[PDB]
Amino acid sequence: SSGGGPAVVNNYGDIHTANYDEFYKGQQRREAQQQAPILPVR
Amino acid sequence: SSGGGPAVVNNYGDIHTANYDEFYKGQQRREAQQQAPILPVR
Amino acid sequence: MLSTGPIMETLTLTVGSAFEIPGWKLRGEYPAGTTSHLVFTDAAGGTLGEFEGTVSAKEIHYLQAPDDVKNIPHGANFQLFVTYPSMQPQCLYFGTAIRKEPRYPLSTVVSPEDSAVQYKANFVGQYIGPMWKPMGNGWGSLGIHTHALISEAPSMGPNYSLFSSAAARWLWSMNMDSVTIVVRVLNVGAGKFNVIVCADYQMQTYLGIQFETGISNNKVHVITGDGPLNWGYQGDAVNNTTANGDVYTIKYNDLLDTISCYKGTSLTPLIEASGLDVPHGEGFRYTGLAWNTALLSPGVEPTAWEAKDGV
Amino acid sequence: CYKGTSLTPLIEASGLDVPHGEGFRYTGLAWNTALLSPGVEPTAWEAKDGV
Amino acid sequence: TDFLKIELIGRDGSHWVLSGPGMGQQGVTLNPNLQQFYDAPVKTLYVPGPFGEEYAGKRVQRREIVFSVQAYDEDPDTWSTVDSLWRWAWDYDEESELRVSTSDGTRFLKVRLMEEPKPYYEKDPHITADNPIVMTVTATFPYWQDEPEELIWTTLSTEDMTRFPVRNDGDVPVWLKWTLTAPGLWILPDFSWGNDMYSRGREDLGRTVAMPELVAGEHVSVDSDPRVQTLIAVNGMPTQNRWKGNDLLYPLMPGKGAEIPVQLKNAPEGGACKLTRPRWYSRPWSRPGV
Amino acid sequence: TDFLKIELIGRDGSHWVLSGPGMGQQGVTLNPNLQQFYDAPVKTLYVPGPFGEEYAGKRVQRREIVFSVQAYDEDPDTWSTVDSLWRWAWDYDEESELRVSTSDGTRFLKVRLMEEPKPYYEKDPHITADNPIVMTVTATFPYWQDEPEELIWTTLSTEDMTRFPVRNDGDVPVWLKWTLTAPGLWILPDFSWGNDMYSRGREDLGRTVAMPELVAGEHVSVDSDPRVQTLIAVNGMPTQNRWKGNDLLYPLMPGKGAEIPVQLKNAPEGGACKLTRPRWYSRPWSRPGV
Amino acid sequence: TDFLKIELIGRDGSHWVLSGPGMGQQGVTLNPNLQQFYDAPVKTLYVPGPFGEEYAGKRVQRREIVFSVQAYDEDPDTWSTVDSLWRWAWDYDEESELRVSTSDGTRFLKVRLMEEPKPYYEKDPHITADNPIVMTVTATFPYWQDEPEELIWTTLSTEDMTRFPVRNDGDVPVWLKWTLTAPGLWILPDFSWGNDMYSRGREDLGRTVAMPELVAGEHVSVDSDPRVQTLIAVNGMPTQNRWKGNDLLYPLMPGKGAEIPVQLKNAPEGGACKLTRPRWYSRPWSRPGV
């Protein structure tokens, strides 16, 4: 039952419902966390 | 047979299985290739 | 299709087999004077073979010796023509000849480089183990003696409950003719102990070194095998004493064909024989041990055994 | 140890308290000189299983 | 049927009749339901506009033909020979010819294996000796074509001119090929035929372009199709390097034809030219179009 | 059928006859509908072009064979023994042979377990003692193989030369392996056979590459296969550093062969050269082609 | 059948016989079609290569077992008790044992609830008192296992040595555990068994590693499996901190066995050693492998 349907689509990963804008915003947030404290205040 | 199934899904392109992580990493790698040599050593 | 053509068929060729086309599958109405020929050709158009079939009133028969069809390869084209009297030849069948035979990919399967092999045995378990195959006396003719009254390692010997002399063969075979057998043995009684080299799978013919330990024997012999439990001596013999825990190295050398025995660390052969008439080579690389005691008690028996391929 | 082709051991020892068997079958060489110059050195080395 | 014949000439030169008169004589017939075989696949382009979308142009796509053949024989050994020969008749690197013959003539398509063939049934094929092979072949050049029409004009004069009758009777524009001898300066026609692709449809009605002055022994081939470089000398000289960015821009549009002029000057020996007009079609059979 | 025999030689040396004469003697038979078994999977590359897309080359893909077997026996205990033996015949790390024997000879494929087998029905297997195992095996090397041909040339001379007869009867190019003794300077053929993948198909028709001078004990294996390093010294010395950028570039193209020349010079004790030529095919069986 | 017996021992110690002799005596039987139950799931890895893809390795995956049980009783109240007991037998945080007993012995798999069970039919379950529960359990450790082989060697000597006979009869590598008393310096074997994972197959054939000198009261457990830290002392001292980057690297490969040597030195009292060899299998039942 699970093997061969949505339960294996989940194993496939982001083939069905998965959004681009949220992923891009998350990557931007991670980069901002990485780089914000080292940017100058000027 | 081929026309109207997975063989035309391939023509559609990245509608089914395709992840965002390696695409973003590849874009970052291309930008790093473009910009790394011209970044100063300081 | 205004003009008829031939029929595509196949012809089977086998090495060492007569090439025959039976007449019952080439049936027809052939008047006297009708001929038939079969032509085998390669891909370039060159004739690899040409044969004439026996045309009778109702059939055409082909029959060729294997030497004629030896040189036609697998996949060569063939055409069969029948010429009626006062008429032009016509092709009945055409196609490719296949070779239906065992195919040998290796040009020469040389003897594989079976590397040197080593084995050892110490006899610490309860029973002998499957690595020793009893000979002559049959299954259950071997056993382990503890020798706890002398504080020594256990030894292999015939089970003296129902046997007095018995032989065992190593389960595996050596890969080369030259071998080395190192045995650590004890002399806790009176008897004869044979180290068997270059034996057959039944231990029918072999070289061997015999240690006789007794009140008067105290001798070492070179022996030739006739049966697992019977042997014949070769040459003279050397007087020898066997103490407990005595190590003897029996080396058989194929080149410079010889058998020799060394005691302990000395490289001088205590006994040596050369030119013994025993078959060698493949199938005669088995090693073994044998015991023969007049009484029903252990005599001279090994506590440790070791075999190495090559000298 | 046998020197040259002599059939009698040049030196011999027995019963040394060293573990034997599997896991203790490695071999090697060693050198120690007081001076910074070659002393006794092996031109050729060969090892063989068994005796 | 006798109205249509389909043949395959393999890369090895083997000849097979899949359908039509004499089909199956070599052991292979053509199963029904073959796709992307008749019309050349074309996709059209559209830009956003006030009333929805506006036409932007068309592009012709490569043919992805999927078809099944049936290899048959009475005995399994001969069936195996037939199947092996059929497999040998195909390749990936080089293309085999697929000819269609009707009352409109014979038109051929060059096809290669797009992927591995799918042979046989579920069980082993020696049981049946009659097995289907599904084949996915591809046509990089998607147009069906006939043998090109060739004309030759030779002269001995130092300066001369000639007229070549040209007419596209097919469905699609064709690209002319020229073979010009050396030495000599040629002027070749590049008529627009009213084609407005560069917004010069009637400005280039009588366009003529001068090839660079060819030196002795530098016979050239001038192929106007975009697949290949335009100017190529047979002695290896870099002729197009001397051409200042000039080129042939216009194909022979369908339904168009005229007496195109060829001019030769400064030819002390007096040279020759050959015009090759391809006959490309988008369909295996079609009535001629005026 | 007697025309086709399929066997498996397991990683533990077990011999199973799945189809053909003697099938099922070991308890396991082969079920129909086995995929990617006959033709080597090849993908073709296409790049945009003027008339759609243009052919850009081919890449062969690893084989993925999904096939079912049936393990059967009269009693559940011995059936369980058979099923356990069949499972023991396979592994993930090490490969086992799948051999196909027909009138064209015997050709094998090295296959390994791609994933875990899917055994039995939905109920208890001991109920029926006759159960199917679904195997998804993979062939990293997708070509069916025959036993490679080995040729030996031993010479006692300081300088000598020999002609190795070589011929590719398969449908795919093969890569030769050389085993050269030391000391000595070897010259080995790197003939292009007309292969033009380095733009030197005619320039390298009789190309010979001189291996670096070998010191005593530096026996070398010189394998043209891209999967392995070309020069490998048996004692571990870096011998490719003395090779100055030269390499063996060309495989043995299909349908090509000759007496390739091998030269030995400066050999104080002679030398021995072994040539191993693989015999690769894309199908379990096929008639010879030329 | 009587050739196979399946039991569940819940988190609370309850015992259920789902299949085999005496099945259903506790009210719960096993429905057909249980999946990912026999073979341990493994995914194989492949890198791009010249001939397609090259084998890169294998990874064993966790078991995701979906199976149905059927809880039944004559009266709905007793059915409710049975259903509640079955629910109490399972948990998410702690694992329950699933034992398979055949002629090859009894092997157990530790499984936990992967998600909420799906009970009952479309109507209320008291109508029938015979209802199915669909269970999606998971095995984080995917190998079926038996009780490990344990050996003990105690001594009174200050310096001593012993040999432990060891042999992997299963189809998967197992990781050894040691229990070593203190004080004393131990030399433990880490034989490669010819395994080439570190490219030191026969280089590490007789590898032995020295544990750090244990002080009084610092009895240690040395577990080679990667799930757990190697050195753990019973008194909480950081023994591994004194073990300067050393580790046990090799598992006991299948089909391999020997008399592994253990050495004890600097032990004034004379210590004790215990060796635990797990019996891991990839299948609920299998004949012993040699």
Radius of gyration of chain E (CA): 24
Cα E170 from Cα E166, distance rounded (Å): 12
The answer to whether F6 touches F111, Cβ cutoff 8 Å, is no
G193: left (phi over 0), alpha (psi -120 to 50) or beta: left
Give the resolution to one decimal, in Å: 3.3
Q: Give Cα separations from E119 to E16, E68, F283, F285 (angstroms).
A: 18, 9, 11, 13
Angle between helices A20-35 and B20-35 (to 10 degrees): 50
Place of tokens 């598992």: G251
Chains that touch F (3 or more CB pairs under 8 A): C, E, G
With CA atoms as reference, the chain A residue closest to B17 would be A15
CA distance G20 to chain F (A): 10
Closest CA to C178 of C76, C284, C288, C20: C284
Q: Verify whether the Cβ–Cβ distance C8 to E22 is below 8 Å.
A: no
Say how far apart CA F24 and CA E198 lie, in whole Å. 73
Which residues of F lie closer than 8 Å to G, measured between beta carbons?
41, 59-62, 76-77, 80-81, 84-85, 87-88, 92-93, 112-120, 122-124, 126-127, 138, 140-143, 226-227
Residues 6+ apart with CB under 8 A from G97: G7, G8, G9, G108, G109, G110, G111
Residues 6+ apart with CB under 8 A from C3: none
For the stretch F262-273, what's the b/e string if a residue is b when 16 or more beta carbons lie within 10 angstroms of its beta carbon?
bbbbebeeebbb
How does DSSP classify residue G270?
A: -
* Residue type present at position A9: V
Q: How far apart are CA F227 and CA F229, in angstroms?
A: 7
> Count of alpha carbons within 13 Å of E105, Cβ hemisphere only?
14
Task: Provide, for chain F, the percentages of residues in helix, strand and coil under a 3-state DSSP scheme, each rounded to the nearest 5.
Answer: 5, 45, 50
Distance, C-alpha C80 to centroid of its chain: 48
Phi, psi of G17 (to 5 degrees): -110, 105
Q: Which chain F residues have any C-beta within 8 angstroms of a chain E C-beta?
A: 1, 3-4, 19, 32-33, 38-44, 46, 49-55, 58, 102-104, 283, 285-287, 289
CA F106 – CA D23 distance, rounded (Å) = 45
How far apart CA G261 and CA G187 sit, in angstroms, is 8
Identify the closest residue of chain F to E12 by CA–CA distance: F290
Contact between E276 and E145 (Cβ < 8 Å): no
C8: nearest CA in chain E? E78
- Cα gap C95→C7, rounded to integer Å: 8
Residue found under tokens 């090397």: F141
Question: How far is residue C75's CA from residue E96's CA, in Å, rounded to a whole number?
Answer: 23
Residues 6 or more apart in contact with residue G22 via CB below 8 angstroms: G5
Among candidate residues F173, F175, F18, F45, the one with its CA nearest the CA of residue F111: F18
Separation in Å, CA of G187 to nearest CA in chain F: 32
CA E66 vs CA E112, E118, E137, F104: distances in Å:
12, 11, 6, 29
For residue E200, the number of C-alpha atoms closer than 13 Å in the C-beta half-sphere is 11
B and D touching (3 or more beta-carbon pairs closer than 8 Å):
no
Whether chain D lies against chain G with 3 or more Cβ pairs closer than 8 A is yes
Residues of D in contact with G194 (CB under 8 A): none
Q: What are the residues whose beta carbons fall under 8 Å from the beta carbon of G98, sequence distance 6 or more?
A: G6, G7, G8, G9, G108, G109, G110, G111, G137
Rounded to the nearest 5 degrees, what angle is found at the Cα of C194, between the Cα atoms of C188 and C195? 115
Please, which residues bridge with residue E101 across strands?
E5, E106
CA–CA separation, G132 vs G33, rounded Å? Answer: 13
Subunits with 3+ C-beta pairs closer than 8 A to G: A, D, F
Q: Give the single-character DSSP code of F267.
A: -
- Alpha carbon distance G146, G140 (integer Å): 16
**Record: contact G287-F77, CB cut-off 8 A:** no
- CA dihedral angle for residue G113, residue G114, residue G120, residue G122, rounded to 10 degrees: 170
- Give the ranges where chain G is alpha helix by DSSP (H): 76-88
Asked if C245 and C151 touch (Cβ cutoff 8 Å), the reply is: no
Which residues are registered as beta bridge partners of C238? C220
The Cα E82–Cα C9 span in angstroms is: 10
Nearest CA in chain E to F46: E140
Q: What is the DSSP letter of E240?
A: G
Question: Tokens 């280089």 map to which residue?
Answer: G203
Contacts 24+ apart (CB under 8 A), A31-37: none
The answer to whether C36 touches C61, Cβ cutoff 8 Å, is no
Q: C103 — contact with chain F (CB < 8 Å)?
A: yes
Size of interface E-F (CB pairs under 8 A): 85
User: Inter-chain contact G261–D26, Cβ cutoff 8 Å?
Assistant: no
F in contact with E (at least 3 C-beta pairs within 8 A): yes
E266 token code pair: 């400064």
Quickly count: other Cβ atoms within 10 Å of residue G88's Cβ: 12
**Are residues G207 and D26, on separate chains, in Cβ contact within 8 Å?**
no
Q: Report yes or no: G115 and G248 within 8 Å, Cβ to Cβ.
A: no
Nearest-angstrom CA–CA distance, F180 and F165: 17
Distance to chain D for C120, nearest Cα, Å: 11
Does residue A3 belong to the interface with chain G, where contact is any CB pair within 8 Å? yes
Place of tokens 């993948």: F197
Q: Which of C248, C267, C268, C287 to probe by mutation at the D interface, max D CB count within 10 Å?
A: C267
Q: How far apart are CA C89 and CA C145, in angstroms?
A: 91
DSSP C202-256: T--S-EEEEEEESSS--EEEEEEESSTT-EEEEEEEEE----TTEEEEEEEETTT
The answer to whether G203 contacts chain D (CB < 8 Å) is no
Q: Which residues fall within 8 angstroms of residue A39, CB to CB, at 6 or more apart? A: none
- Closest CA–CA distance from residue A9 to any residue of chain G (Å): 15
Count CB neighbours of F131 within 10 A: 19
Whole-number Å distance between alpha carbons of E98 and F248: 39
Cis peptide leading into residue B6 (ω within 30°):
no
E111 interaction partners in chain F (CB closer than 8 Å): none
CA–CA separation, F136 and E260 (whole Å): 65
Secondary structure E strands in chain B: none
Return the structure tokens found at C127: 């029973």
